[PDB]
Write a protein that binds this ligand. Structure first.
Ligand SMILES: O=C(O)CNC(=O)C(=O)O
Ligand SMILES: [Mg+2]
Ligand code: NI
Ligand SMILES: [Zn+2]
Length: 331
């Protein structure tokens, strides 16, 4: 079995190997990359996402989210308070202000320590989940707006044509902006490109051990667990590496820098934080290997998780027994 310790693997494809996206994902899996839940892909030196980022300031962040924490430093939830619209140029200025900027630090490890010690005492503002793309249309390789769609994958594998679309999302971050522990909708893959700015630190639980994380979460968030049998779908709970280690949960960590891709694999729980002002682009995707995960994915029906239009068909076709209950939670 390849990668039996479930370590995060880092790949350096050549420009030739960067042509065929599906083929390269399958290669990484042949080497055991999915066992970690997360892989890093450093593009060939010849590649670029676009020519420059000099002209992005007028993008609008219609609903910036202030991420307010409750709990203790290593075990907390966050809620998202909506803020007034602002442009990317306005948000960058805010991220660089004395109130929100990255503190002085020695290295990524020192900054990580500072994040876990102090995150709860601040409320950073995240420009998350903005439909759009920063890839140039002429970028042919690993262009996250030009991937094969999940609807087409399901049709190819299963023969059923379904409605829905699959487009990318932009994320503008600042110091301490946080992504809570989650798997993707329908336990899909994700791919995330860090276009510019400061790093993003990731934590991940191997898919084979995801249920260990879920059991800890139920213990640590006991009211939330009574409310919903899949409350991590709400994407609000944080647990620190120290708490994970104290509770014997297998995990790994890595820091993504600008110009790098990360892939999350089906049922790979992940969480993390941004070091400072940055912009990432991410999208979900599927492969043949996903189908069995999609069929088994948990679902939130309590009403909290509310998701896209396109998840309807995935539930309806892959999980017909669950469909009626899940759709009630959507309405
Ligand atoms: O970058 C973020 O805030 C969160 N991204 C992801 O969870 C992802 O790409 O799957
Ligand atoms: Mg602009
Ligand atoms: Ni994710
Ligand atoms: Zn729920």
């Amino acid at each position: 079995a390849q990668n039996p310790n479930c370590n995060i693997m880092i790949f350096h494809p050549t420009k030739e190997e960067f042509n065929d996206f599906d083929k390269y994902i399958a290669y990484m899996e042949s080497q055991g990359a999915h066992r970690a839940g997360l892989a890093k892909i450093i593009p060939p030196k010849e590649w670029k996402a676009r020519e420059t980022y000099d002209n992005i300031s007028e993008i609008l962040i219609a609903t910036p989210l202030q991420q307010v924490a409750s709990g203790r430093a290593g075990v907390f939830t966050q809620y998202h308070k909506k803020k007034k619209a602002m442009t990317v140029g306005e948000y960058r200025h805010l991220a660089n202000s004395k109130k929100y900027q990255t503190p002085p630090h020695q290295n990524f490890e020192d900054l990580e320590r500072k994040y876990w010690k102090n995150r709860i005492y601040n409320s950073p503002i995240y420009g998350a989940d903005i439909s759009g793309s920063l890839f140039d249309e002429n970028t042919k390789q690993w262009n996250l707006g030009h991937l094969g769609t999940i609807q087409d994958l399901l049709e190819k594998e299963c023969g059923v044509v379904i409605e829905g679309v699959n487009t990318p999302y932009l994320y503008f971050g600042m110091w301490k902006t946080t992504f809570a522990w989650h798997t993707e909708d329908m336990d899909l893959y994700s791919i995330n490109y860090l276009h510019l700015g400061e790093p993003k630190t990731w934590y991940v639980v191997p898919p084979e051990h995801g249920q260990r994380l879920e059991r800890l979460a139920r213990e640590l968030f006991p009211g939330s667990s009574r409310g919903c049998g899949a409350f991590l779908r709400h994407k609000v709970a944080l647990i620190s590496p120290t708490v994970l280690k104290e509770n014997g949960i297998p995990f790994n960590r890595i820091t993504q820098e600008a110009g790098e891709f990360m892939v999350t694999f089906p049922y790979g729980y992940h969480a993390g934080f941004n070091h400072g002002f940055n912009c990432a682009e991410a999208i979900n995707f599927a492969t043949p290997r996903w189908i069995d995960y999609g069929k088994m994915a948990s679902q939130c029906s309590c009403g909290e998780a509310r998701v896209t239009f396109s998840m309807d068909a995935f539930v309806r076709i892959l999980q017909p027994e669950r469909y009626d209950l899940w759709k009630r939670g959507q309405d």
